[PDB]
Each structure stands twice: as structure tokens, then as C-alpha cells.
Enzyme design. Structure first.
Site, PDB file in Angstrom:
ATOM      1  N   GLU B 117      47.473  48.678  41.296  1.00 10.21           N
ATOM      2  CA  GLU B 117      47.323  48.065  42.923  1.00 10.21           C
ATOM      3  C   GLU B 117      48.158  46.801  42.708  1.00 10.21           C
ATOM      4  OE1 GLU B 117      43.331  47.581  43.601  1.00 10.21           O
ATOM      5  OE2 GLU B 117      43.598  46.488  45.510  1.00 10.21           O
ATOM      6  N   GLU B 203      40.617  40.645  54.169  1.00  9.97           N
ATOM      7  CA  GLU B 203      39.429  40.718  53.403  1.00  9.97           C
ATOM      8  C   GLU B 203      38.360  39.633  53.495  1.00  9.97           C
ATOM      9  OE1 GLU B 203      39.997  41.255  49.011  1.00  9.97           O
ATOM     10  OE2 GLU B 203      40.935  43.254  49.286  1.00  9.97           O
TER      11      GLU B 203
END
Ligand SMILES: *[C@@H]1O[C@H](CO)[C@@H](O[C@@H]2O[C@H](CO)[C@@H](O[C@@H]3O[C@H](CO[C@H]4O[C@H](CO[C@H]5O[C@H](CO)[C@@H](O)[C@H](O)[C@@H]5O[C@H]5O[C@H](CO)[C@@H](O)[C@H](O)[C@@H]5O)[C@@H](O)[C@H](O[C@H]5O[C@H](CO)[C@@H](O)[C@H](O)[C@@H]5O[C@H]5O[C@H](CO)[C@@H](O)[C@H](O)[C@@H]5O)[C@@H]4O)[C@@H](O)[C@H](O[C@H]4O[C@H](CO)[C@@H](O)[C@H](O)[C@@H]4O[C@H]4O[C@H](CO)[C@@H](O)[C@H](O)[C@@H]4O)[C@@H]3O)[C@H](O)[C@H]2NC(C)=O)[C@H](O)[C@H]1NC(C)=O
Ligand SMILES: *[C@@H]1O[C@H](CO)[C@@H](O[C@@H]2O[C@H](CO)[C@@H](O[C@@H]3O[C@H](CO[C@H]4O[C@H](CO[C@H]5O[C@H](CO)[C@@H](O)[C@H](O)[C@@H]5O)[C@@H](O)[C@H](O)[C@@H]4O)[C@@H](O)[C@H](O[C@H]4O[C@H](CO)[C@@H](O)[C@H](O)[C@@H]4O[C@H]4O[C@H](CO)[C@@H](O)[C@H](O)[C@@H]4O)[C@@H]3O)[C@H](O)[C@H]2NC(C)=O)[C@H](O)[C@H]1NC(C)=O
Ligand SMILES: *[C@@H]1O[C@H](CO)[C@@H](O[C@@H]2O[C@H](CO)[C@@H](O[C@@H]3O[C@H](CO)[C@@H](O)[C@H](O)[C@@H]3O)[C@H](O)[C@H]2NC(C)=O)[C@H](O)[C@H]1NC(C)=O
Ligand SMILES: *[C@@H]1O[C@H](CO)[C@@H](O[C@@H]2O[C@H](CO)[C@@H](O)[C@H](O)[C@H]2NC(C)=O)[C@H](O)[C@H]1NC(C)=O
Ligand SMILES: *[C@@H]1O[C@H](CO)[C@@H](O[C@@H]2O[C@H](CO)[C@@H](O)[C@H](O)[C@H]2NC(C)=O)[C@H](O)[C@H]1NC(C)=O
Ligand SMILES: *[C@@H]1O[C@H](CO)[C@@H](O[C@@H]2O[C@H](CO)[C@@H](O)[C@H](O)[C@H]2NC(C)=O)[C@H](O)[C@H]1NC(C)=O
Ligand SMILES: *[C@@H]1O[C@H](CO)[C@@H](O[C@@H]2O[C@H](CO)[C@@H](O)[C@H](O)[C@H]2NC(C)=O)[C@H](O)[C@H]1NC(C)=O
Ligand SMILES: *[C@@H]1O[C@H](CO)[C@@H](O)[C@H](O)[C@H]1NC(C)=O
Ligand SMILES: *[C@@H]1O[C@H](CO)[C@@H](O)[C@H](O)[C@H]1NC(C)=O
Ligand SMILES: *[C@@H]1O[C@H](CO)[C@@H](O)[C@H](O)[C@H]1NC(C)=O
Lengths: 752, 222
Positions: B117, B203
Site C-alpha cells: 500500500e 481519513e
């Protein structure tokens, strides 16, 4: 014991900072807060009341892909000079104004511990730091500060620890300026661009030969023994060397083995430590922690153990994970103080033998994602295991009846091996939180003694094994389990009785078990936050219209391949795949989309369903796989189907659909469209060739399509299958919250 | 039109703007409602808005994302992953914690479980920071007039590399192939990994009366 001016000062200092999360809530001028020394982060001398310790240091907690810190985001106030006698100031991991280190800090003259690390202090050191002559230990690491002149250092002769990691370090001759400190036991220069600055042999000659013990040099772009060779001038008296993350492409210098006291060596995350540790490592004697992770050291494992035999008795943590290390694992018990050994993701193709006749103290062992074979050893020799990782190998035999002696064991992973059975003695573990022995070749019946005395169990995984799990009828298990994956295990001819007692589970996979009674009445009180219920591929009965509860935020419901009956259970509100195929349902599906649903895949095929399809498909826009085939359905195709902005497969074969086909223009993206045996009439419309450019399968057989064929159907050019008989003229979807942050991708294209 | 469903989405031609409240039940007593404003060929425009307060404030709550669907191509064989982004962000009161990040992933197979990631954070607020096994940056890199600090840490099996902008960027633009190739040469990502998903969103950890406006999000795999 508290002194007045100091509280006053400390309070004005707090008045500038914004604690926001607390930490400074226990600070105040109040009568109830009247001794400042019983406050959080202050300690006072017992006789003179003057404060000696102030630390507002803050750590940070990491969840998932993110880690968080309560930083103080304040202004750092010079009223602190009044404290007069503090030997300890720690403001680590706090963000202030991301500004110069304030000069008033140097005007203390009685500090011994200044730690401003991992804040955002920027600019460059005030030269006034040379006034701080009293400083034993300084940490200023991991800030945003530039370091071009090191002149002040000479004055802090008292230092025993200096970190300047994470600097814009641009000093040509630190060697001189750092050997000027008589008592520097430890130095940190990580991420200081040390490689660009290389000590000359000459500058090393004009130096003070300090007795240095601990070195951190991680994050410096060395890549060869050259730019770090200066290190071995402290060969006399070193203990730790941290050369992790250095792009090190070379064989490790045999010098390290020679160092007498090395006890800690991290060379992890390098480019190519070709081979591995040399033979000088046989001379290391005392050692405690070695880390060559992610270095691609291609070395025979037991020769590594030969070359560490200098430290059978001192080595505690050995990390050789994610490397190309081959061989077999023999006599790891010989290493009497080995507590952690990490060998996962190597190329090891041998046996886990241990025959020394000694006992190991390994608490953590990881041999996963290798190629290992042979049976496991008697694990009674490894009693201290807290977690035993062994998956993705080729082990065989039964699990040894000595595994019952692992009391501190919490995690056991023996997935994807070819093991052949379980002893009853693991009904003695009682601390085993997660037990995964999936995808093995286990055979036999598991009795309640197999799982006796295991109160701390929360994950059980026995997927796709040749196994059986029957308890006694009146057995009450000592465990409540959140995750229960028992696919392809016959759990009883009767619906497993033990599940009446489990109420904390959130994922139930009892599929391909051999089960044949009707759905028990107690099972309706299934836990209120289940996200994955897979009851499919059995002979379960009952009408699940009133036997399942609705809108429990499901995520996966698969009730297919059974003898369920009744009308369709009203679909829960937040479910994403809802599979009801291969059953004996019937009636309207007028209830599907009266309520809004975001299901992405529903399969209603191979039922006795009937009626006219409701015209509410804009209440389920999210569908991409629709499977109504093999049901008796009469009616016009509802114009609402035009409302499926994404639909990847539309299965309508073997119904009694009549009328023209409705506008499907807006469903531009689809790959499969079959309407076989549907008795449907009208010309084959233009939009099949016009808006539905995307398409791979088109089946309109045994219908009634009058009219000629548009030749425009030749313009798709990705269409692979075309069937239009008897008329008279790499795919998948996703479930989002499956793995927390990460979605899951499910395949649905099958027999072509 | 803005829509508040937990796993709701909105396929939009080249880009899909998912809203995931994949962690709503963090005892965070709040709601989030996302939504697309404009479409203009390669460039999209969208917004969200939220109010997550309390409960677990150590945690992320949602990643509304702008995503690309593309020909999944190996890292070796990408010439250019051009992208740009412009946004501004609005909040109220106190305890505003959140970030703004790109999120790329890679696996062995075009359809495999995420193995690597790559996050590239344009903004970090309130104490929000990337998973790091150390607490400290592995290295600092400069790309296309932006300075980034790299952290690496484990999300279970995924290895998460995270670049953090020293300048909290309100107008990003760059070639993410430079980032991917930096990692391949220097930290150890295999070039054989297949690039799987490109996402860009925020986020949130805590906040009240928040609203992000994306003036543009052009992005590509060529
Ligand atoms: C100026 O201020 C600065 C700012 O604060 C100061 O900087 C701080 O200094 C502190 C020391 O004074 C540092 O504190 C110590 O941290 C280490 C870190 O290593 C461990 O943690 C890492 C991350 O994992 C943990 O972190 C998060 C947050 O808590 C959790 O979510 C995790 O779950 C995890 O918590 C685990 O750990 C506890 C500890 O027992 C467990 O019980 C839990 O159940 C959790 O599982 C990580 O880097 C380490 O892990 C490595 O290995 C793992 C598996 O073993 C692997 O998963 C990792 O990825 C990593 O792997 C790498 O290495 C392996 C080989 O090992 C390779 O295979 C792999 O490839 C990788 O290369 C490790 O988990 C920590 O060890 C310390 O803990 C001891 O001391 C504290 C008290 O100080 C206690 O609270 C601890 O319980 C423990 O205490 C006793 O127990 C030890 C044995 O268990 C014993 O040996 C001890 O001596 C002691 O007796 C500290 O926690 C702090 O990190 C640092 N912060 C920063 C930002 O710099 C600075 O010092 C100051 N200047 C001064 C003072 O001059
Ligand atoms: C509700 O539950 C039901 C039942 O539990 C679910 O339906 C089932 O879902 C299962 C998971 O998808 C599925 O099992 C998979 O089937 C795939 C296709 O099978 C092919 O290959 C097998 C080979 O098996 C033979 O050998 C084994 C080993 O000895 C024997 O045990 C078998 O009996 C056979 O002798 C063929 O037999 C088939 O005909 C097909 O050709 C498999 O690919 C898949 O295996 C993959 O994952 C395994 C995980 O451990 C792995 O071991 C295996 O090697 C495969 O690896 C995959 O992943 C890697 C990495 O990407 C990739 O490289 C590989 O190419 C491969 O993709 C599973 O075995 C059941 O068949 C299926 N049953 C039914 C009735 O559909 C249902 O899905 C669930 N509900 C929901 C909503 O999901
Ligand atoms: C492991 O350690 C041993 C012992 O320290 C190393 O062998 C020894 O190496 C030293 C080198 O300084 C030798 O000492 C000196 O050698 C010279 C000749 O080079 C001699 O003239 C001196 O009088 C002095 O003896 C020593 O002879 C040698 N062998 C011993 C002590 O048996 C060994 O090199 C180390 N292992 C590895 C793999 O490097
Ligand atoms: C706490 O204060 C006392 C005195 O206020 C300190 O005691 C002195 O200690 C040194 C060295 O130990 C002696 O030489 C002096 O004679 C002591 N003076 C008195 C009056 O006892 C003590 O060291 C201080 N400790 C800390 C941690 O601050
Ligand atoms: C650093 O230490 C020196 C030495 O004490 C300080 O210089 C003194 O400054 C005062 C200020 O009026 C003079 O009276 C002294 O005569 C000076 N002494 C010497 C030897 O120069 C200097 O001020 C200190 N720096 C700080 C910030 O306190
Ligand atoms: C029932 O399951 C829940 C989780 O689904 C358990 O809750 C968490 O358990 C972990 C285990 O260590 C704790 O760290 C958390 O603090 C718990 N959180 C909450 C919100 O409860 C719960 O403990 C389980 N209960 C029983 C009796 O097994
Ligand atoms: C689509 O779903 C909505 C609910 O979101 C349905 O609306 C409800 O309909 C009933 C009677 O049919 C009313 O009593 C409710 O007040 C309505 N609720 C809301 C929130 O509007 C709607 O009928 C569905 N559409 C179709 C075509 O079935
Ligand atoms: C420093 O190291 C080099 C090579 O390791 C050596 O030749 C030199 O004599 C050393 N000097 C001291 C003082 O240890
Ligand atoms: C579990 O095993 C231990 C060890 O023999 C014993 O002390 C305890 O009584 C056992 N409990 C049950 C319920 O069998
Ligand atoms: C069910 O379908 C068959 C053809 O498949 C048809 O003959 C029968 O009449 C249908 N049932 C009805 C219309 O009630």
C-alpha cells in the site's frame, strides 16, 4: 513541598499551550489543586521544594493504517526559567509553534536531560546551547532543524548521549567535533545524510578516540562498507549498531564478528547482503539481537546457526524474515536464550527437527510462507510459545499429542499445510485465542474433549478439511467465538446444538457440513451484529421469511443449496450479497425493492418463484449481478431495469417473460445479458449495439423476436458469445467493508 | 446529489467516488454524507461533509475516495501515472483530527490480495499521522517541488509505505510513477507488483461541521 513562584510560572506556561485532550487538566490555581508536585508530569525535590522534573512527552497509538498523537500545539513560554533546578525536561512528540528552539532553554545552567525530539522544532540550533554546559543527555531528534555549525558541542563535555537524527545535517567534520566529548556512550545520526559526509582517514587520525558504545545510523544512504567504515575505530567498546535502511549492497564486513562486545546488530531492510553473516560471526560470543530482515541474504540456515554458535547462550531475538534463506531448521533448541525467531517468507525446504535433548525458551516463532516438509517435532519441548506461526508450508503427520503442554500459547496458525489430525490434548490450551488449521488434510472426529478447557477462544477456523465435529448432546462449551469458519465439516445431522449457546459471533460459515433438519427455533435469536452468515450447501429446512431477522447490517447472506421454503425473506437493509438460489421459495418478489437496498449481487435463481417483477429497481440501484433465471416468471421486463447504472450480468433465462424488452440504454456498462427461453417479443433494438458497447455474452434464444437483425451488433468487438436461435427473424464485483479498510473482490463468471 | 449511505458509491465514467464509512461504529457518534458536483472530461469535482465526534478518536472513521478504474498494468510498464488535485477544507471549533491522502495498492496478480500500500499524504492535522513501526521516517525524498518524509509500517499483511508532505499541500500535481519507482529502486518494492487501485480522499479521526471541496482530480495510468 510546592514553591509559589513555580506554580505561578507553570500556570502562565500552561496559559499559552492548548492541551485540548487533557494532560494539563490537573494544573490549576485552585485550592483543590494546591500542591503542584502531585500534578501530572511534575516531580519535586523532597527537601528543597524546587521542581526537578518536567516531561510533557507524549507517545502515539496506531490503529489500522494510521497512528495518532495528542500533540500540544501551543506556545512554549519562557516563564519556565523560574523553575531554576530542573535536571529533566522532556517535550517529545508534541507540536508547538513549529518554530525555532527557544533560546531561553539554554539559560537554565542546571539541566541534564533535554529531549525535544520528534516535535517540529525548526530553523537551526541557537548558539546559546554552548551555555548549557551541564547537559548529560540531549535528544533533539526527528525535528525539522538544519545543522551547519557544531561549534557549541565542544562545550558540553558532560554529554553521555546525543541524538541528532533526522536533521538537515550538512557538517563536513563531525568526527572531530563529536570525538571532542569525553563521555559520549551513545550517538544517533540517523537520516542525517551521513553518506555525503564521510570521515577522512586524516580526520580520524586527528581525533580523541572516545569509548563509544551505542550507534544509530539508520536511514543514511551508505550502500557500501566504505561510507560506514569509520565505525570500526570504536572496535574496542561497542554494543549496538543500527545500520537498518541503508541500501546496503555488499557482503557484510567481517569486522562486525571481530567486535568483542557487540550485543545488538540491526542490518534490516537493505538492498543485497549477498550471502549472509561471515565466519567472523563465530567469534561474537555475547550477542542478543540480530536483524537481517528484507536483505535477500541467500544463506544456508544451519551454517548461519554455526556462525552464531559463538552466542548459543546470549542470543535472544533473531530476525531473518523475508529473505531467500534455504535449508532446514535443525536444533534451534541449542540456542538456549532464543526467545523470538522470525523466518517467515524465506525459501526454506526442509524439516523442523529438534533432537538435541534440551528445552527451548522460544515465546514467538514464525516459519510461514516457506516450503517446509516433514512432520512437526514434539512441541512439548517448546512450552513457552505464546504464538506459533507455521502456515503455508508442506508439513504432514498429526499434530503432536504434546501440544497440550503449551499453556502460554495464544495463537496457532497451521493453515495450508498437509497435516492429518488433531489430538485431544489441545482441549487443554485455555489461552488459545485464535486457532486456524484451515486447508489441511485433517481427518477424523473432534469431540468435546478436543475443545475442553479452552475458555479463551475467539477464532476457530477449520475450513475445507475432511473433518467431523460432534459434541455431546448436553455439552456447554467454555467459549464464545466471534469468528466461526467451519466449512466442509459435518457438524451433526442435526443443526449443531452448541451454537444455541454462542451469542458473540459475527461471521458464521457452516457450509458443506452435512446437515438435514429444519432451522431450529432458537437460532432466530442470532447475534444482532452478524456480517457474514453462510448456511448454504446443506439440507436445512424451514421458511426463513420469519426465521431471519432484518436490517441487522448484514454484509454477506448466503442461504443457497437447501430445502428452505416460503416466500422470500424481506431483504435486510445494508446487505451487499444476498444469495437465495437452489431452494423452494415461491410467490412475488414484490417485496425485494419496496425498501431501499444497496445489494451489489443477489441470486434468486432455481426457485419456484412466480408473478410479475415489481417496478421498483431504482430502490436497488447498486446491483451489478442480477440472477432471476430458472424461476417461473410472467410479465413485461420492468422499465425500472433501465435504472441499473452498473449491472455486469443479467440472468433471465428460463422464465415466461412476455412483452417487449424495456429501455436499457442507461445501463451502458454490462458484460452478460441472457434472456433465454423467455418468450419475449419485439425487434432486437438498436441500443444493444448502440449504448451497450460493453458486452461479452448475448443470449436471446427461444423467444419471439420479430423483425430483422441490426448489423450494428458487429460493432461491439469484445462480445465473445452470440446465440440468437429459434426466433423467426476475468469478471468480478466487490464487497466494501469486508476486511475493514480493504474491500473484497468476488468472482461470478463461471462455466463459459 | 449528496448521499449518506455507509457503503454507497457513484460510478462516474473514468472515476468512481466511493464513500466508505468503513469504520462508522467506532462509537464516533456522527454522520457523513458525500457527493459529486461536476464532471468535465478527465477532471472531476466532488465534496463530502462529516461530523465524527468522540468514542475512539485514535481511529479513522471513513475514507471517502475518488477512485480510478484503469487497465491494471505492472509497475515496470507504467510510463506515467500523472495526477493532480485541488481542494480546500472547512471545519469548526476544536479537536479537528484528520488527513488528506492518496492510497495506491499492489499485489502479485492483477486480482490479488493487497500486498503493498502506497499512501501519499497531502495534509496532516491535529496529530494525524501514518502507521509507522518506528515513529520515525525511514527517509526524506523530494519530487516535483514537493518534499516528502517516508514512513513504513505493517497493516496486518499489507506493508504500508506512506509519504508525508512537509508542506501541507492544497494544490498537488505530480507523476505517481516517480513515487512508485523510487520505492522499487530504494526501499524494496518489486517491479513485478501489479498496480491495483488509485484512491484519493480524506481519513477523518474527529471533527465537527467539516466540508471538503475538490476543484479538480485529474488522474491517469499510461
Ligand atoms: C526522547 O523522547 C522520545 C519520544 O518518545 C523517546 O523515544 C521513545 O523511546 C522509548 C524508549 O525509552 C521507546 O519505547 C520502546 O519502544 C520499543 C519499540 O519496539 C516495539 O514496538 C514497536 C511497535 O510495536 C508496538 O507499538 C504500538 C504502540 O504501542 C502497538 O500498537 C503495538 O502492538 C506494539 O506494542 C507491542 O509491544 C508490547 C511490548 O511488550 C507488547 O506486549 C504488545 O502486546 C504489542 O505486541 C516495534 O518497532 C517493535 O517490534 C519489532 O518486532 C515486532 C515483533 O517482535 C514486529 O512486529 C515489528 O514490526 C518490529 O519488527 C522488526 O524487528 C523484527 C525482529 O524483532 C524483524 O523480524 C522485523 O523485520 C522488523 O525488522 C517492538 O514491538 C519497545 O520495545 C519498548 O518496550 C519496552 O519498554 C517499555 C517501557 O519503556 C515497556 O512499556 C515495554 O513493555 C517494554 O518494557 C520491558 O519489556 C521488554 C521485553 O518485552 C524488555 O526487553 C524491556 O527492556 C523492558 O524490560 C518501548 O515501548 C519509543 O518507541 C520511542 N519513541 C519514539 C517516537 O522515538 C526517546 O527515548 C527520548 N530520548 C531519550 C530518553 O534519551
Ligand atoms: C458459502 O460457502 C460456500 C461453500 O463453502 C462457498 O462456495 C465455495 O466457495 C469456495 C471458495 O471460493 C470454493 O472453493 C474454491 O474453488 C476454486 C475453484 O476450484 C478449482 O480447483 C479445484 C481444485 O481442487 C482439487 O484439489 C483440491 C486439493 O486436493 C481438492 O480438495 C479438490 O477436491 C479437488 O481435487 C477443482 O477441483 C475445481 O473444479 C476448480 O478447477 C478454487 O480455485 C479455490 O481454491 C483456491 O483457494 C484456495 C485457498 O486455500 C487455495 O488452496 C487453492 O490453491 C486455490 O488458490 C486460489 O488462489 C490463488 C491465489 O490467487 C490462485 O493462484 C489459484 O489459482 C486459486 O485461485 C477454492 O477451492 C468452493 O468450490 C465453492 N463451492 C461452491 C458450491 O460454490 C460460497 O462461495 C460461500 N458464499 C459466499 C457468498 O462466498
Ligand atoms: C576469530 O578470532 C581469532 C582470535 O582472535 C582470529 O584469529 C587470530 O587473529 C589474530 C589477528 O590479530 C592473530 O593474532 C596475531 O597474528 C599475527 C599474524 O597475523 C601474529 O604475528 C601475532 O603475534 C598475533 O598472534 C592470531 O594468530 C589468530 N589466531 C589465533 C589467535 O588462534 C580469527 O581471525 C577470527 N575469525 C575470523 C573468521 O576472522
Ligand atoms: C535535593 O535537594 C537537596 C538539598 O536541597 C540535595 O542535597 C545535596 O546533595 C549534594 C549531593 O548529593 C550534597 O553535596 C549536598 O550537601 C546536599 N545538600 C543538602 C542541603 O543536603 C539533593 O541532591 C537534591 N536532589 C535532587 C534530585 O534534586
Ligand atoms: C554563557 O556563559 C558566559 C560565561 O559566564 C556568559 O558571559 C558572561 O555574561 C555576563 C553578562 O553581563 C558577564 O557579566 C560576564 O562577565 C560574562 N562572562 C564571561 C566569561 O564572558 C554568557 O552571558 C552566557 N550566556 C548566557 C545566554 O547566559
Ligand atoms: C464480545 O465480543 C466483543 C468484540 O466483538 C468484545 O469486545 C472487545 O474485546 C476486546 C478483547 O480484548 C477488548 O480489547 C475490547 O475492549 C472489547 N470492546 C468492547 C466494545 O467490548 C467483548 O469483550 C466480547 N465479550 C465477551 C464476554 O466475550
Ligand atoms: C422505495 O423505498 C421507499 C423508502 O425509502 C418507499 O417509501 C415508503 O413507502 C411506504 C408505502 O409504500 C410509505 O408508507 C413510507 O412513508 C415511504 N417511506 C419513505 C421514506 O418514503 C418507496 O415506496 C419505495 N419505492 C417503490 C417503488 O417501491
Ligand atoms: C581506524 O580504522 C582503520 C580501519 O578499520 C584502522 O586501519 C585504523 O588504524 C583505526 N584507528 C584506530 C585508532 O582504531
Ligand atoms: C482444566 O485442566 C486443569 C489441569 O489438569 C485442571 O486443573 C482443571 O480443573 C481443568 N478444568 C476442567 C473443567 O476440566
Ligand atoms: C410456468 O412455466 C411454464 C413454462 O416453463 C408454463 O407452461 C406454465 O404455464 C407456467 N406457469 C404459470 C403460467 O402459471
Amino acid at each position: 513541598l510546592c514553591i509559589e513562584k513555580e506554580r505561578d510560572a507553570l500556570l502562565e506556561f500552561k496559559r499559552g499551550l492548548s492541551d485540548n485532550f487533557g494532560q494539563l487538566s490537573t494544573w490549576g490555581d485552585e485550592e483543590d489543586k494546591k500542591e503542584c508536585c502531585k500534578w501530572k508530569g511534575i516531580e519535586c525535590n523532597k527537601t528543597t521544594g524546587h521542581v526537578i522534573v518536567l516531561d510533557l512527552h507524549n507517545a502515539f497509538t496506531c490503529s489500522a493504517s494510521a497512528c495518532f498523537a495528542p500533540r500540544l500545539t501551543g506556545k512554549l513560554s519562557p516563564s519556565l526559567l523560574e523553575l531554576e533546578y530542573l535536571n529533566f525536561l522532556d517535550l517529545s512528540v508534541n507540536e508547538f509553534e513549529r518554530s525555532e528552539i527557544p533560546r531561553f532553554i539554554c539559560s537554565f545552567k542546571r539541566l541534564e536531560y533535554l529531549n525535544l525530539s520528534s516535535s517540529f522544532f525548526s530553523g537551526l540550533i541557537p548558539t546559546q546551547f554552548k551555555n548549557l554546559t551541564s547537559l548529560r543527555i540531549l535528544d533533539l531528534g526527528y525535528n525539522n532543524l538544519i545543522v551547519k555549525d557544531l561549534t557549541w558541542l565542544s562545550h558540553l563535555s558532560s554529554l553521555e548521549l546525543l541524538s541528532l537524527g533526522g536533521s538537515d545535517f550538512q557538517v563536513k567534520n563531525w568526527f572531530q567535533e563529536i570525538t571532542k566529548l569525553p563521555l559520549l556512550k551513545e550517538l544517533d545520526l540517523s537520516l542525517c545524510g551521513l553518506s555525503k559526509l564521510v570521515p577522512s582517514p586524516a580526520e580520524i587520525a586527528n581525533s580523541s578516540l572516545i569509548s563509544l558504545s551505542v550507534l544509530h545510523l539508520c536511514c543514511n544512504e551508505f550502500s557500501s562498507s566504505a561510507k560506514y567504515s569509520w565505525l570500526f575505530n570504536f572496535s574496542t567498546s561497542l554494543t549496538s549498531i543500527d545500520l537498518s535502511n541503508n541500501q546496503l549492497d555488499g557482503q557484510i564486513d567481517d569486522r562486525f564478528g571481530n567486535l568483542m562486545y557487540l550485543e545488538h546488530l540491526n542490518l534490516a531492510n537493505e538492498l543485497n547482503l549477498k550471502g549472509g553473516i561471515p565466519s567472523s560471526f563465530g567469534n561474537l560470543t555475547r550477542l542478543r539481537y540480530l536483524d537481517m530482515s528484507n536483505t535477500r541474504t541467500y544463506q544456508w540456515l544451519p551454517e548461519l546457526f554455526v556462525r552464531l554458535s559463538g552466542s548459543r547462550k546470549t542470543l535472544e531475538v533473531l530476525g531473518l524474515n523475508d529473505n531467500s534463506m534455504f535449508g532446514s531448521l535443525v536444533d534451534v533448541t541449542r540456542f538456549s536464550a532464543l526467545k523470538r525467531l522470525y523466518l517467515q517468507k524465506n525459501v526454506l525446504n526442509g524439516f523442523f527437527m529438534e533432537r538435541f535433548g534440551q528445552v527451548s525458551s522460544l515465546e514467538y516463532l514464525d516459519l510461514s510462507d516457506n516450503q517446509m516438509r516433514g512432520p512437526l517435532p514434539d512441541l512439548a519441548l517448546f512450552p513457552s510459545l505464546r504464538e506459533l506461526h507455521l502456515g503455508s508450508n508442506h508439513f504432514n503427520g498429526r499434530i503432536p499429542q504434546g501440544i497440550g503442554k503449551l499453556s502460554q500459547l495464544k495463537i496457532l496458525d497451521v493453515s495450508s499445510n498437509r497435516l492429518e489430525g488433531l489430538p485431544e490434548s489441545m482441549g487443554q490450551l485455555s489461552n488459545l485465542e485464535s486457532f486456524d488449521a484451515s486447508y489441511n488434510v485433517l481427518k477424523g472426529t473432534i469431540t468435546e474433549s478436543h475443545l475442553s478447557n479452552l475458555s479463551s477462544l475467539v477464532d476457530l477456523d477449520l475450513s475445507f478439511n475432511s473433518l467431523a465435529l460432534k459434541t455431546s448432546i448436553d455439552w456447554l462449551p467454555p467459549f464464545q467465538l466471534q469468528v466461526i469458519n467451519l466449512p466442509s465439516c459435518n457438524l451433526g445431522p442435526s443443526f449443531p446444538k452448541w451454537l444455541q449457546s454462542q451469542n458473540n459471533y459475527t461471521v458464521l460459515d457452516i457450509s458443506l457440513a452435512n446437515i438435514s433438519d429444519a432451522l431450529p427455533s432458537w437460532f432466530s435469536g442470532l447475534p444482532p451484529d452478524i456480517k457474514i452468515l453462510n448456511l448454504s450447501n446443506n439440507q436445512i429446512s424451514g421458511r426463513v421469511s420469519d426465521l431471519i431477522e432484518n436490517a441487522y447490517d448484514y454484509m454477506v447472506i448466503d442461504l443457497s443449496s437447501n430445502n428452505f421454503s416460503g416466500p422470500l425473506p424481506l431483504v435486510p437493509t445494508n446487505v451487499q450479497i444476498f444469495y437465495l438460489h437452489k431452494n423452494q421459495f415461491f410467490g412475488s418478489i414484490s417485496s425485494i425493492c419496496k425498501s431501499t437496498t444497496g445489494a451489489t449481487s443477489l441470486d434468486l435463481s432455481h426457485n419456484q418463484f412466480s408473478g410479475e417483477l415489481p417496478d421498483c429497481w431504482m430502490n436497488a440501484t447498486n446491483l451489478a449481478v442480477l440472477n432471476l433465471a430458472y424461476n417461473n416468471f410472467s410479465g413485461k421486463l420492468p422499465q425500472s431495469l433501465g435504472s441499473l447504472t452498473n449491472l455486469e450480468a443479467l440472468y433471465m433465462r428460463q422464465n415466461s417473460f412476455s412483452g417487449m424488452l424495456p429501455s436499457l440504454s442507461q445501463c451502458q456498462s454490462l458484460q452478460i445479458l441472457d434472456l433465454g427461453g423467455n418468450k419475449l417479443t419485439g425487434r432486437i433494438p438498436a441500443w444493444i449495439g448502440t449504448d451497450l458497447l460493453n458486452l461479452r455474452i448475448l443470449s436471446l434464444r427461444f423467444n419471439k423476436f420479430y423483425g430483422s437483425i441490426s448489423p450494428i451488433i458487429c460493432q461491439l468487438q469484445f462480445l465473445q458469445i452470440l446465440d440468437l436461435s429459434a426466433n423467426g427473424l476475468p469478471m468480478e464485483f466487490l464487497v466494501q467493508g469486508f476486511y475493514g479498510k480493504y474491500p473484497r473482490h468476488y468472482s461470478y463468471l463461471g462455466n463459459l | 446529489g449528496d448521499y449518506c449511505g455507509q457503503w454507497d458509491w457513484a460510478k462516474s465514467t473514468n472515476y468512481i467516488v466511493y464513500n466508505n464509512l468503513w469504520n462508522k461504529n467506532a462509537a464516533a457518534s456522527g454522520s457523513q454524507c458525500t457527493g459529486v458536483d461536476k464532471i468535465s472530461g478527465s477532471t472531476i469535482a466532488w465534496h463530502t461533509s462529516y461530523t465524527w465526534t468522540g468514542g475512539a478518536a485514535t481511529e479513522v472513521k471513513s475514507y471517502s475516495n475518488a477512485a480510478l478504474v484503469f487497465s491494471k498494468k505492472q509497475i515496470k510498464n507504467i510510463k506515467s501515472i500523472p495526477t493532480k488535485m485541488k481542494y480546500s477544507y472547512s471545519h469548526s471549533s476544536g479537536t479537528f483530527v484528520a488527513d488528506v491522502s492518496y492510497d495506491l495498492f499492489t499485489s502479485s496478480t492483477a486480482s490479488g490480495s493487497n500486498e503493498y500500500e502506497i499512501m501519499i499524504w497531502l495534509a496532516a492535522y491535529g496529530g494525524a499521522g501514518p502507521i509507522s513501526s518506528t515513529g520515525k521516517a525511514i527517509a526524506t525524498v523530494t519530487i516535483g517541488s514537493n518534499s516528502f518524509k517516508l514512513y513504513k509500517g505493517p497493516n496486518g499483511s499489507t506493508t504500508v509505505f506512506s509519504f508525508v508532505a512537509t508542506k501541507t499541500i492544497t494544490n498537488f500535481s505530480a507523476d505517481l510513477q516517480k513515487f512508485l519507482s523510487y520505492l522499487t529502486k530504494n526501499q524494496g518494492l518489486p517491479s513485478s507488483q501489479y498496480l491495483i487501485t488509485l484512491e484519493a480522499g480524506t481519513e477523518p479521526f474527529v471533527g465537527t461541521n467539516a466540508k471538503m471541496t475538490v476543484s479538480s482530480f485529474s488522474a491517469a495510468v499510461n
